[PDB]
Amino acid sequence: MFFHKKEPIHVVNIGEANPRFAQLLLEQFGGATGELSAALQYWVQSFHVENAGIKDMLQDIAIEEFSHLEMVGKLIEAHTKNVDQTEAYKSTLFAVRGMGPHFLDSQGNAWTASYLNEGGDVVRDLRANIAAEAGARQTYEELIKLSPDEGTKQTLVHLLTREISHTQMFMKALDSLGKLTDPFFGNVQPDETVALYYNLSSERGPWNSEPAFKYVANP
Amino acid sequence: MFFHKKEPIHVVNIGEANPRFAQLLLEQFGGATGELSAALQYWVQSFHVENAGIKDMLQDIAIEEFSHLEMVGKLIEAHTKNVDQTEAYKSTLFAVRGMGPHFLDSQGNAWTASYLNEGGDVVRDLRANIAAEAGARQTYEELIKLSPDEGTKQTLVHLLTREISHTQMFMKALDSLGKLTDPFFGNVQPDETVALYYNLSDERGPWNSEPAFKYVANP
Amino acid sequence: MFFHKKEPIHVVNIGEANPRFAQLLLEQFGGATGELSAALQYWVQSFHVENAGIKDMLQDIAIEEFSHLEMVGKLIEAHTKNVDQTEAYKSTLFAVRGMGPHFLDSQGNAWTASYLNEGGDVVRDLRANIAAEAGARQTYEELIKLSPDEGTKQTLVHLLTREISHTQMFMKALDSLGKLTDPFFGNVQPDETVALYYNLSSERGPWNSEPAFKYVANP
Amino acid sequence: MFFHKKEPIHVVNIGEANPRFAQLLLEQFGGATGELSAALQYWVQSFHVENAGIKDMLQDIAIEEFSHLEMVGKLIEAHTKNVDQTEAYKSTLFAVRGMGPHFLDSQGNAWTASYLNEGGDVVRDLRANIAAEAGARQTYEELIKLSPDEGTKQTLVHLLTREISHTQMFMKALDSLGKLTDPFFGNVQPDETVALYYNLSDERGPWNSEPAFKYVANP
Amino acid sequence: MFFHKKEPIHVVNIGEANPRFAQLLLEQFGGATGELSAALQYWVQSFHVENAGIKDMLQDIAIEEFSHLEMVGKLIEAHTKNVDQTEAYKSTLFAVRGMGPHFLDSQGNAWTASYLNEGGDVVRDLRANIAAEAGARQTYEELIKLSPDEGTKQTLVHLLTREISHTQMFMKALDSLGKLTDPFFGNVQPDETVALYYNLSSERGPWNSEPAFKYVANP
Amino acid sequence: MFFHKKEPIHVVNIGEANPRFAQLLLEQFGGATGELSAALQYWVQSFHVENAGIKDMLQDIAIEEFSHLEMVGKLIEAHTKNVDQTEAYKSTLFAVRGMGPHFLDSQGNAWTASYLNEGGDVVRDLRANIAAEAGARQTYEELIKLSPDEGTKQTLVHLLTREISHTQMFMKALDSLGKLTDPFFGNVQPDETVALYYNLSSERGPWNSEPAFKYVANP
Ligand SMILES: [Ca+2]
Ligand SMILES: [Ca+2]
Ligand SMILES: [Ca+2]
Ligand SMILES: [Ca+2]
Ligand SMILES: [Ca+2]
Ligand SMILES: [Ca+2]
Ligand SMILES: [Ca+2]
Ligand SMILES: [Ca+2]
Ligand SMILES: [Ca+2]
Ligand SMILES: [Ca+2]
Ligand SMILES: [Mn+2]
Ligand SMILES: [Mn+2]
Ligand SMILES: [Mn+2]
Ligand SMILES: [Mn+2]
Ligand SMILES: [Mn+2]
Ligand SMILES: [Mn+2]
Ligand SMILES: [Mn+2]
Ligand SMILES: [Mn+2]
Ligand SMILES: [Mn+2]
Ligand SMILES: [Mn+2]
Ligand SMILES: [Mn+2]
Ligand SMILES: [Mn+2]
């Protein structure tokens, strides 16, 4: 059951409204690595996660992401607030889509559920969640490097922080299953070619050397 | 440059043609967790990966996935050959689209680059590659349990096996950077709320408690 | 700020699990007229709705829809629970996508934000919300006509009920603005052709007759 | 059958060519609230609307929208003619896509039938048509305020005017069924929780209180 | 301007309703090779084709494609009407989407303008149209071989026949420009490699023999 | 099987980085007329083309299209590397998506298999390919006229030239089947209306004159 308290976790604080940046910020509202993606991925996973311990974790983190989503939407509201007659505004998608957040990315691409990565075994879900957090932190860094003022930059820092936090949670959820560094899961046992490496593009490293792999220099 | 030799990795060996299974098999041709996704994700990453070692690894694997894509395509061609009058065939999308593989999934959804997860830091790429590898293994397991004949099963088992192989390659690469189990990456320093968990939805675990998290029961 | 209490408003109650129907039910999870659509439309609208009275209404209804979304996801979980070896299951998308809800419709189409209808003046938002409720109720009726058991049929009846409720709320939100039956809004005054009707496909009614319109039988 | 005569409704009268505005104008050619959406939504409804009167109305309007689509297309052709060397033109999608209209929106998003809202009950269709009409009017207003010359503005004003006209036609049709202000439609009888409001997020209103709703302050 | 008389190019007649065939038939309505693709592509091209003769031809053909679209819709309508309770109907997407045509294909994929090939040069446009025609005729043939009855079969045969006609029109247009059998077009001068053929996959034919090509047997 | 050597068809050389041109260049990478469309379309066709000669030709060409794709990627890479701080770069989608090519077009649209035209008959396939080639050459020309420097211009000229080459290959293949100038193909016999031309829009040409057509001046 969903409840809602109106004010956000952190609080809206920006400088002069920056509509051009607000459009870049849509990437974390309606974009692939955005907050809607995280919130919906971890939540839809929880429905088929049998272990109550991890199902709870997914739901806690998911609900937090709904609050991050709320926050980003407020930054976008403020950065497109009372500036609809400026020329900076007129060069943004907000000029035709209206002020405020919209569930699209910075390129105007509507949010798709193809952004999501979930299903089957919990190992896939957790590994997909780790990847989604990596994408999230990445986009948050690029936006911080482009942030208009300081109040924005630090709200984005807090968000970027929580994704590093979440990354740990998922990493520890896997560790409890002993599947953190163990590449194998599922029920299908591998054949004899499992430790082979094919040099199909022609460099050496631990990914193609002993004791981990039998390197095949020329197929 | 690309080069192609006509012989596949493993020759196609199927029982009687099963066009309904052929449609399910499209999940690995034009599906989200499919071979085109793997091939394109790793290859597009190689254009912005600086480490010459890791870049080469991404290309080696990507080229293999193209060859996996070929095998999946040959399986689908075989299970839809000379059967366009059976009622099984007429209940598939192959009846209107034509025999052989197409870049759709099992639900007829056209492949979309929205499936891909890539960009920026190599830590993200490798983590995205590990997640992608999981979903590929998962989908392959489901197809294995639904396989129509033993020859088809073995070909799918080998394909699944290579995803296990690829997972290890990606882990060893991520581990060689010391970032396989280290949640932090990037340039943005974390703040004060890093090691805090919020009970926004009581099940507990290492993701939730000491020594890595301070539990907040009621926010 | 989002909070979550684990158990749903109503309670899971079905008969024998029906995976084929569960797929039809995805229409209200990840479909156009589904619960995610309503929840996200009314919520993203609230960010640019200036009137606090209506902004609150949108948020109340939106949060309720998140709980409807939770409910439908539980029906789908139950109707795909412990049936993964039946042949009914094997003919569904769940066979390859895994058990449990997924943010796609009954046709396997991923949820898109193009489903959403919002922006600009509150009159558009409310009229779009009325339309979204009409679509919602429609799909709920078709599913009720196809429901497997009685416990399902009545959970769907309660959902269909609340959408008729919501329809009223929006209809009364417009009435408070005096824009319920008044076709005009915005700031652009119409020209002289506003009351014309062009017979471009060649029947009469109030939509093309006096006193409302000047009918043009032949352009 | 369809018939086309080469002369548009209003001849194109623009100032100097403005290719940047031409891109914004694509919102009414290949955009969500655009003329193709209106034309196709109303037309596809006519195939399942039983009432011979309403069905004819949908076709009359749909054919007009096709003619509106033509005018928008002519506007876009005019504002992108013989200017492919100006730097304004080179900053638009017309530089790679070619001059003239294309079935994309102002962000380059290909038109998608996901824009359409239709199906089942005629009450839904008309309500979907009213909502669609609102978004069309809204987008037209924004384009009017951003128009490059007076001749372009007047053409857009007339187009906006017809959407006001169409809204009334749809209202009169919905009213003739007694369903313009009546929230109920369909065959499924409502249950016990029909007239109940939940304060899940205190602002009050006719949507929230007596005599139509029993307020639930804390669920 | 557009105009519409109510009877199709010719009477549509079917046997009993076959809703399962109607879903397949959606390919020619909201599918890639369907009538909407043909209509829109040729029409959108007319806005930038400078040859008044070829422009008119495109318009002539597009308007006929609209009439074909109406026919396909009416066939789909007839094959889905009054058969709600039948088990065949319940196995189709019409069960949840409603009776009659919808702008999607046989798989439930919403129609997208990405189906269209157009822009820039008339030679590109005309070649695209010949290709689109070939896809339409191909799809029609597959439907014809799946025909539920004879009345339907003869309608689809006529529609197929008209695509052959259009192909001849487009070829005559291409041939009037001298570009039907001459590959070169545009304003860019080719370099020294225009006659090279690379044997990158390992067969001979006119595509890699003298006089036309310098065959590179081993790159 | 697939194989990869590391150097392209020829050396890629540019001037200074022009990230704004690199975004335009994405059309030939992840765009509709791009190299991925060409590669995948011709390759996927090879799985169902029965003519061993034409099958091999399709494979030969597709593998070359892959090499072109690598080149386009490398051009995009060079034009986006080491220029993060520059204001031009910050105006591009690379600012949020990262340096280098991504499988999207100049508008940010993710690549989709809906760009592909294929299936059924080799004649349909070959005509589709001639059309795809025409789109590629057209796009290349627009990029060439927008070239940032001479090194880039000469690479795009070569790539354009190779499309002219492919067009000749596909034409020779079509001509070997006797279907280059003959519209008819497939297994369905046309009816009595194959030579009719309808003047539905109101010009004359070989597309509607004797000997080929019976012109219907007024339907
Ligand atoms: Ca290597
Ligand atoms: Ca489907
Ligand atoms: Ca908890
Ligand atoms: Ca009429
Ligand atoms: Ca864009
Ligand atoms: Ca409230
Ligand atoms: Ca789809
Ligand atoms: Ca060869
Ligand atoms: Ca898009
Ligand atoms: Ca004409
Ligand atoms: Mn977050
Ligand atoms: Mn997170
Ligand atoms: Mn693979
Ligand atoms: Mn793999
Ligand atoms: Mn609801
Ligand atoms: Mn509702
Ligand atoms: Mn209009
Ligand atoms: Mn209208
Ligand atoms: Mn046609
Ligand atoms: Mn045609
Ligand atoms: Mn090429
Ligand atoms: Mn080519």
TrEMBL record, chains A, C, E, F:
Residue positions binding Mn(2+) 1: E35, E65, H68, E163
Top-level taxon of the source organism: Bacteria
DNA repair is among the record's keywords: no
Residues that, per the record, bind Ca(2+) 1: D56, D60, N199, S201
UniProt keywords, alphabetically: Calcium, Metal-binding
Binding site for Ca(2+) 2: Q107
Residues involved in Mn(2+) 2 binding: E65, E133, E163, H166
Residues reported in the UniProt entry to bind Ca(2+) 3: N109
Record-given protein name: Alr3090 protein
